[PDB]
Amino acid sequence: GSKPFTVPILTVEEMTNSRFPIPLEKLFTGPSGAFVVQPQNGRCTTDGVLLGTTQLSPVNICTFRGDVTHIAGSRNYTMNLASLNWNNYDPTEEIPAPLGTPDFVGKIQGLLTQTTKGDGSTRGHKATVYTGSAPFTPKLGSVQFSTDTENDFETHQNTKFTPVGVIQDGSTTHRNEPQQWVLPSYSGRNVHNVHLAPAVAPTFPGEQLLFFRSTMPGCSGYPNMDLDCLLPQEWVQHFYQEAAPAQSDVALLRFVNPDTGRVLFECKLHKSGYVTVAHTGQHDLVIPPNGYFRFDSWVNQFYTLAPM
Amino acid sequence: GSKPFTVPILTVEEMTNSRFPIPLEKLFTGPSGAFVVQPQNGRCTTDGVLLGTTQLSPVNICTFRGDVTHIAGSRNYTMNLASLNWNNYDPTEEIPAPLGTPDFVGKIQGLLTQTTKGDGSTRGHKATVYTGSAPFTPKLGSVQFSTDTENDFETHQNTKFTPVGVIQDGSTTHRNEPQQWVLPSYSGRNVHNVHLAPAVAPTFPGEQLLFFRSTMPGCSGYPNMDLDCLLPQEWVQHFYQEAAPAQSDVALLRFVNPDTGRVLFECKLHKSGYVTVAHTGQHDLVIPPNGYFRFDSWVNQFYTLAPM
Ligand SMILES: CC(=O)N[C@@H]1[C@@H](O[C@@H]2O[C@H](CO)[C@H](O)[C@H](O)[C@H]2O)[C@H](O[C@@H]2O[C@@H](C)[C@@H](O)[C@@H](O)[C@@H]2O)[C@@H](CO)O[C@@H]1O
Ligand SMILES: CC(=O)N[C@@H]1[C@@H](O[C@@H]2O[C@H](CO)[C@H](O)[C@H](O)[C@H]2O)[C@H](O[C@@H]2O[C@@H](C)[C@@H](O)[C@@H](O)[C@@H]2O)[C@@H](CO)O[C@@H]1O
Numbered sequence: 302g303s304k305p306f307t308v309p310i311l312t313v314e315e316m317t318n319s320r321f322p323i324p325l326e327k328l329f330t331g332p333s334g335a336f337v338v339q340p341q342n343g344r345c346t347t348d349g350v351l352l353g354t355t356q357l358s359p360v361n362i363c364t365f366r367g368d369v370t371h372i373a374g375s376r377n378y379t380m381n382l383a384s385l386n387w388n389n390y391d392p393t394e395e396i397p398a399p400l401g402t403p404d405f406v407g408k409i410q411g412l413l414t415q416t417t418k419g420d421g422s423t424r425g426h427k428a429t430v431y432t433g434s435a436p437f438t439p440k441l442g443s444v445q446f447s448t449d450t451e452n453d454f455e456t457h458q459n460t461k462f463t464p465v466g467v468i469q470d471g472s473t474t475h476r477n478e479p480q481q482w483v484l485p486s487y488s489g490r491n492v493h494n495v496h497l498a499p500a501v502a503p504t505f506p507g508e509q510l511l512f513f514r515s516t517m518p519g520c521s522g523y524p525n526m527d528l529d530c531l532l533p534q535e536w537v538q539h540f541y542q543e544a545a546p547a548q549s550d551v552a553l554l555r556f557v558n559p560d561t562g563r564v565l566f567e568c569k570l571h572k573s574g575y576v577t578v579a580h581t582g583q584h585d586l587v588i589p590p591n592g593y594f595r596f597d598s599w600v601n602q603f604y605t606l607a608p609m
Numbered sequence: 610g611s612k613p614f615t616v617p618i619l620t621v622e623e624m625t626n627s628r629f630p631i632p633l634e635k636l637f638t639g640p641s642g643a644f645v646v647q648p649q650n651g652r653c654t655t656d657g658v659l660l661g662t663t664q665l666s667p668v669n670i671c672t673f674r675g676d677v678t679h680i681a682g683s684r685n686y687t688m689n690l691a692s693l694n695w696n697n698y699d700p701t702e703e704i705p706a707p708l709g710t711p712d713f714v715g716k717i718q719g720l721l722t723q724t725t726k727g728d729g730s731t732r733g734h735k736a737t738v739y740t741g742s743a744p745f746t747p748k749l750g751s752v753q754f755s756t757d758t759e760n761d762f763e764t765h766q767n768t769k770f771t772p773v774g775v776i777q778d779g780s781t782t783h784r785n786e787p788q789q790w791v792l793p794s795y796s797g798r799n800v801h802n803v804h805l806a807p808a809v810a811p812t813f814p815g816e817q818l819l820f821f822r823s824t825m826p827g828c829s830g831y832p833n834m835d836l837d838c839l840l841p842q843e844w845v846q847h848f849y850q851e852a853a854p855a856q857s858d859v860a861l862l863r864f865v866n867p868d869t870g871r872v873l874f875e876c877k878l879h880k881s882g883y884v885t886v887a888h889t890g891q892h893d894l895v896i897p898p899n900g901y902f903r904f905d906s907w908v909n910q911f912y913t914l915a916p917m
Contacts, residue, residue, distance in 0.1 A: 310850050314694065315665045322630065322668045357623045359667045360630045386622065410733060412720065412773040414826040416834070421783065423827025423834075425718060425774060427735050461826055465720040465771045466733060475729065518722040518769055519731025526724070526731075538843065542618050 306347065306545040306552060308570070309535050310593050316533035317359045318515040319343025320404060320481075322464065325533060328586035329514040330578055330609070336482055337500045338510065341397055341404035343530040344498035345537040347552060347572045349544035353498030356385060356400035357541060359534040363403045365430070365444060365462040369413075369454050376451050378413070378428075380460060382442050387459065390442050395496045398439040398487040403464075406433040407479025410520040411464040413446055415454055426450045428462065432485040440487035440495075466518030467526065475523035501531065503577045504602060511568055511576040531575040540574075547572035549599040558589045565592060566609045569600070579606035614655065614853040614860060616878070617843050618901050624841035625667045626823040627651025628712060628789075630772065633841060636894035637822040638886055638917070644790055645808045646818065649705055649712035651838040652806035653845040655860060655880045657852035661806030664693060664708035665849060667842040671711045671772040673738070673752060676765050677721075684759050686721070686736075688768060690750050695767065698750050703804050706747040706795040711772075714741040715787025718828040719772040721754055723762055734758045736770060740793040748795035748803075774826030775834065783831035809839065811885045812910060819876055819884040839883040848882075855880035857907040866897045873900060874917045877908075887914035 309316070316325045320342045341353030342362055351357075366387055369378040382390045385400045403409060413428035428448040431437065436445035446462065454460065467479050487494050503509055512529035519526050552570040557563075565588065568578045586609075617624075624633045628650045649661030650670055659665075674695055677686040690698045693708045711717060721736035736756040739745065744753035754770065762768065777786050795802050811817055820837035827834050860878040865871075873896065876886045894917075 311665065311846065317666060317668055324666050324668060357619065358625060358632050360625055360632060410720075412718075412735070412826075412828065414774050414828055416827050421827075421831050421834075422779075423774075423776070423829060423832060425776075425826065425828025427720070463773045463826065465773075466722050466731075468731070468733075471730075518720075518733065518771065519724050519729075520720065520722050520733025521731060523729050524731060526729075535846065538619065 303548055304543070304545040306596055307543065308554065308594050308596050309539050311535055312591060312593055313513070313588065314590065316535045318513065318528060319530040319532055319534040319537055320362065321515065321517055321528050322360050322362050323515045323517060325513050325515055327514050328588060329512045329529060329584070330509045330580050330586065331583040333502065333510055338482060338502065339484060339497060339500040340531060341484065341498055342401070343532050343534065343537060345532060345540050345574045347540055347545070347570060347574060348547050349540040349542070351541065352574070354396060354398050354400050354402045354404060355537060357538055361385065361401040363409060363464040364401055367460060368457050369460045370456055371451070371454065376448050378446050378448060378454060380444050380446060382439060382444065392440060392442055397494050397496050402439045402487070403432045404484060405479055405481045406483040406485055408468045409464050410466055410468050411462055413448055413460060413462050415458050415460045417455055417458050424453050426453060429468065430462065435490060437485055438489045441489065466520045467524045468520050469522030469524035471522040476525040479525055481528055499573070501575045505577065507581060508577045508579055508606065509581070511578045550601045551599070551604060552596055553598050553600045553604065554594045555597050556592055557595050559591050560589055567606055569604065569606065578609045580609040611856055612851070612853040614904055615851065616862065616902050616904050617847050619843055620899060620901055621821070621896065622898065624843045626821065626836060627838040627840055627842040627845055628670065629823065629825055629836050630668050630670050631823045631825060633821050633823055635822050636896060637820045637837060637892070638817045638888050638894065639891040641810065641818055646790060646810065647792060647805060647808040648839060649792065649806050650709070651840050651842065651845060653840060653848050653882045655848055655878065655882060656855050657848040657850070659849065662704060662706050662708050662710050662712060663845060665846055669693065669709040671717060672709055673770040675768060677762050677768045678764055679759070679762065684756050686754050686756060686762060688752050688754060690747060690752065700748060700750055705802050705804050710747045710795065711740045712792060713787055713789045714791040714793055716776045717772050718774055718776050719770055721756055721768060721770050723766055723768045725763055725766050732761050734761060737776065738770065743798060745793055746797045749797065774828045775832045776828050777830030777832035779830040784833040787833055789836055807881070809883045813885065815889055816885045816887055816914070817889070819886045858909045859912060860904055861906050861908045861912065862902045863905050864900055865903050867899050868897055875914055877912065877914065886917045888917040
């Protein structure tokens, strides 16, 4: 008597990255035994429980909201954060950081915009947040932005950060940042992160994670623009609504080609919200534009996949 | 033998505007008899046929892709457009303009970003497109951007526009632009638009359109930041996948409050993809955060709604 489980029939290129507000481009698999894979956005169980800092909006990912204060002698501003819905932020909520907070170390550039309530005057400036920096303390309710102005922003007026892309210091090794698999210190460098969505890894020999991959825009230097999420944002929204019970640890999915009527490959969708495939090595999957995932049956962690 | 029709159970504040990449904030109704309501984004039939310039990605709305050429003596660049998927753009496709093109007259500000293929060097600059301007000819394959640079962008390298918000000329009447209900001239001022999604209006006495409303960020001046769409982007994605046949002209929806178990109001979801309610005058709806739409039955255009 369990509600039947399903995944969306949207194709990969019809879906959105859950870790940055950009479209998916491709599927990628590679080894990740050497390091911890623990993203906090795009985390959701198959029965619809949001984890980490995951929230439902594709466009709220890596945004910030609040009001700002200027740092004299600079073009830097401190943002005192509001909640996702512009109310008072509560640091004691059982989350790692405000929902939608970036979950990787990098220099994220976008625009800081503001409206003055009284007359509806507005202003917007290019701005960058360094999520690896000492003032990056979103869990404690504040982050710092570098901007292109020393005086234009007003205090105590609603201010929004909209992300666009990432930058790198071109005097250093190319593509050495961002580091998408390094979590920020949400409460600052001397404080451990809390309430995290768990790290994920394949346990089965010869299996690797299957990533939903995008390329982040670059705004300066030579950044590493690869960005891999565990679930498309549309899958997060789907499971959240459906809330179908997980009848076992693992949902077997087949990736189907409607142009031939044949299955390209099969994969495991684990109930805690990630996908694995039977393959060894780094590989950009080549898929038909009309290809889609289809849930076929509940299996478990001991199931042997056909090689990808 | 028709597949059962449904709408998503996401709440309003859990969904995304289909005309700009920002969250929904509220429901709004007002009279629109005096003017033509003909948006081209967020247009989809209840049985899943995309119309106008509508595409499936919430983050692709009001983006542009292509390569750029500098205009000497200025900080202006012409973008020769690529398709939504970075291929050659075909001006003869039966659409008004490239998918995701802005469907209103306004000055849209964001970032123009670029990557050089050979070495992975990147650059990003603040940029504005005036969709009412003479060089705004997206259907013909080109638009113009004003930027903060006269020399940094390279030719013949992939270039992306990411929208953030809107601006207004502060020397003129406040909130006189953008004009969200004025379509751009997609082929320029002397050429009529083609392949448009149709204009919509209530036909029933005492009914008005029900709008899904957001506030666009403002980046300069005193802009009109109201933005009303006919369908949430998540509804577009839902109908596209479900493709449930419309058994009549009108789906009756009830907006339900789970905190009391009572219906707040009922409304008509027309098969061509828009909502009406029984109300006269401008009104910001006040709704419970957990409120949701529920499809109850197929009726038709002659059905009399309970007053909102
Ligand atoms: C030394 C330094 O950090 N300079 C950056 C500048 O980057 C340098 O730009 C050069 C050409 O303009 C070379 O490409 C150098 O390798 C590079 O380090 C940076 O310019 C941004 O990124 C570079 C790589 C180019 O893509 C530029 O087009 C782009 O604007 C600017 C912009 O923030 O800042 C310093 O001047
Ligand atoms: C005359 C003109 O168009 N000036 C804009 C400037 O706007 C003026 O800014 C004043 C205060 O700086 C007053 O607010 C004027 O009413 C306004 O016309 C504009 O500044 C942007 O928008 C204004 C309304 C303020 O919100 C500013 O904070 C904001 O930067 C700037 C920025 O593009 O351009 C011209 O200088």
